[PDB]
Design an enzyme around this catalytic site. Sequence first.
Site, mmCIF file in Angstrom:
data_model
loop_
_atom_site.group_PDB
_atom_site.id
_atom_site.type_symbol
_atom_site.label_atom_id
_atom_site.label_comp_id
_atom_site.label_asym_id
_atom_site.label_seq_id
_atom_site.Cartn_x
_atom_site.Cartn_y
_atom_site.Cartn_z
ATOM 1 N N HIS A 155 0.812 -1.204 0.000
ATOM 2 C CA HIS A 155 0.000 0.000 0.000
ATOM 3 C C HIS A 155 0.859 1.274 0.000
ATOM 4 O O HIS A 155 0.698 2.147 -0.873
ATOM 5 C CB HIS A 155 -0.980 -0.038 1.187
ATOM 6 C CG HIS A 155 -1.831 1.188 1.312
ATOM 7 N ND1 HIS A 155 -3.166 1.209 0.972
ATOM 8 C CD2 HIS A 155 -1.532 2.439 1.744
ATOM 9 C CE1 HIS A 155 -3.652 2.423 1.175
ATOM 10 N NE2 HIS A 155 -2.676 3.190 1.635
ATOM 11 N N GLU A 156 1.816 1.375 0.925
ATOM 12 C CA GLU A 156 2.648 2.580 0.984
ATOM 13 C C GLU A 156 3.436 2.812 -0.303
ATOM 14 O O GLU A 156 3.542 3.948 -0.786
ATOM 15 C CB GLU A 156 3.611 2.572 2.183
ATOM 16 C CG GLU A 156 2.913 2.633 3.559
ATOM 17 C CD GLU A 156 1.892 3.742 3.659
ATOM 18 O OE1 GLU A 156 2.154 4.842 3.123
ATOM 19 O OE2 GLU A 156 0.825 3.524 4.276
ATOM 20 N N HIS A 174 1.716 4.692 -2.877
ATOM 21 C CA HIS A 174 1.831 6.146 -2.687
ATOM 22 C C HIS A 174 3.192 6.644 -3.161
ATOM 23 O O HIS A 174 3.279 7.695 -3.779
ATOM 24 C CB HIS A 174 1.657 6.575 -1.220
ATOM 25 C CG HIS A 174 0.280 6.390 -0.667
ATOM 26 N ND1 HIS A 174 -0.861 6.758 -1.347
ATOM 27 C CD2 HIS A 174 -0.133 5.933 0.542
ATOM 28 C CE1 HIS A 174 -1.919 6.508 -0.595
ATOM 29 N NE2 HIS A 174 -1.503 6.024 0.564
ATOM 30 N N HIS A 209 -5.368 7.309 -2.773
ATOM 31 C CA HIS A 209 -6.294 6.327 -2.257
ATOM 32 C C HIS A 209 -7.381 6.047 -3.271
ATOM 33 O O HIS A 209 -7.779 6.929 -4.039
ATOM 34 C CB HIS A 209 -6.931 6.811 -0.971
ATOM 35 C CG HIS A 209 -6.026 6.721 0.210
ATOM 36 N ND1 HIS A 209 -5.928 7.720 1.153
ATOM 37 C CD2 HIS A 209 -5.155 5.757 0.584
ATOM 38 C CE1 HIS A 209 -5.044 7.364 2.072
ATOM 39 N NE2 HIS A 209 -4.566 6.174 1.749
HETATM 40 ZN ZN LIG Z 1 -2.645 5.241 2.069
#
Ligand SMILES: [Zn+2]
Lengths: 163, 165
Positions: free
Chosen positions: A119-120, A123, A129
Amino acid sequence: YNVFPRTLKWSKMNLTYRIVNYTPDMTHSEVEKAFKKAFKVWSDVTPLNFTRLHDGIADIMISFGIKEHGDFYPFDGPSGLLAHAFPPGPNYGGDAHFDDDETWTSSSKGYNLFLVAAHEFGHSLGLDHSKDPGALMFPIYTYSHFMLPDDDVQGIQSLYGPG
Amino acid sequence: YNVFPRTLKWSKMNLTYRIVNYTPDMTHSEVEKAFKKAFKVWSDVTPLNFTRLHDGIADIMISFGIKEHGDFYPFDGPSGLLAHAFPPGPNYGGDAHFDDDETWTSSSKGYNLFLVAAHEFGHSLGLDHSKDPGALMFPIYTYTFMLPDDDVQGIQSLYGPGDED
Ligand SMILES: [Zn+2]
Ligand SMILES: CNC(=O)[C@@H](NC(=O)c1ccc(-c2ccc(Cl)cc2)o1)C1CCCCC1
Ligand SMILES: [Ca+2]
Ligand SMILES: [Ca+2]
Ligand SMILES: [Ca+2]
Ligand SMILES: [Ca+2]
Ligand SMILES: [Ca+2]
Ligand SMILES: [Ca+2]
Ligand SMILES: [Zn+2]
Ligand SMILES: [Zn+2]
Ligand SMILES: [Zn+2]
């Protein structure tokens, strides 16, 4: 006039990362494996390549910290904020920070480091998101084999194209 | 799915601000009016709305401080750096800090709070400095109000014009 330009994407396909320090909760090898597998999530469906450096400056600097840890986006003790990462760019750009007041694991007992890192790193590569509750890029954490959802595949390929 | 916006901007049109504390130099009312008028500079040429909060967490937190005041941009006593503001973003993004070692005024003496604030809020909204020496976003203070066209074009590139009439 000028606006604050956002490096939507990395202008290069070959990126480096460095594990600056380590959580007490997992072995060094477990941590290295989780991070390696989290990058492979993205490299598997794009032309992006990731190589680990052991010293000096890398595009994606990874670290564990608690509370105020040098970027004035302090963490908040156990629960709540789990980790954060900067979008692509110079300096802090790309970097990923994990809150070492959480319990990190290779399993389900606490927070799975692999999944949060995956997930990170989304980014770190320019993804925001998602609204799709099934997407890896959804803002809410939920917990042997992982398949990148189509929503994430489309998001990242819209930036970098397929492998 | 969503990719990061091409430009650093707020993703919502309704923004909140909070005056956290106040300079010794002006009344509360004088400070409130100056900031209200500075936000109107930008709300008048976009679809942005600004609502004041009296406490809690706002999108744009405004404070006066001196020297080290809780970020990587310490002020430097009278003169020099006057103020700064962070681009749109989480936590401190949008926040605006004013150096309270300066003399803040509602006139032409010292630094006119209204004019410095209008400039800072441009940063809070996603504008960097302009090379146009007539622009509000030009990086050097000068006292004068009508938002220059370089700034109108800049802010509308980000948020559109809202109601043109
Ligand atoms: Zn996030
Ligand atoms: C007198 N001091 C300044 O002008 C310094 N300015 C600031 O810190 C600053 C913040 C807000 C402004 C500013 C700039 C243009 C206009 Cl029309 C109104 C306000 O300027 C600047 C001077 C050049 C070097 C960087 C700091
Ligand atoms: Ca970096
Ligand atoms: Ca936490
Ligand atoms: Ca821990
Ligand atoms: Ca100063
Ligand atoms: Ca803020
Ligand atoms: Ca003062
Ligand atoms: Zn951090
Ligand atoms: Zn500051
Ligand atoms: Zn400025």
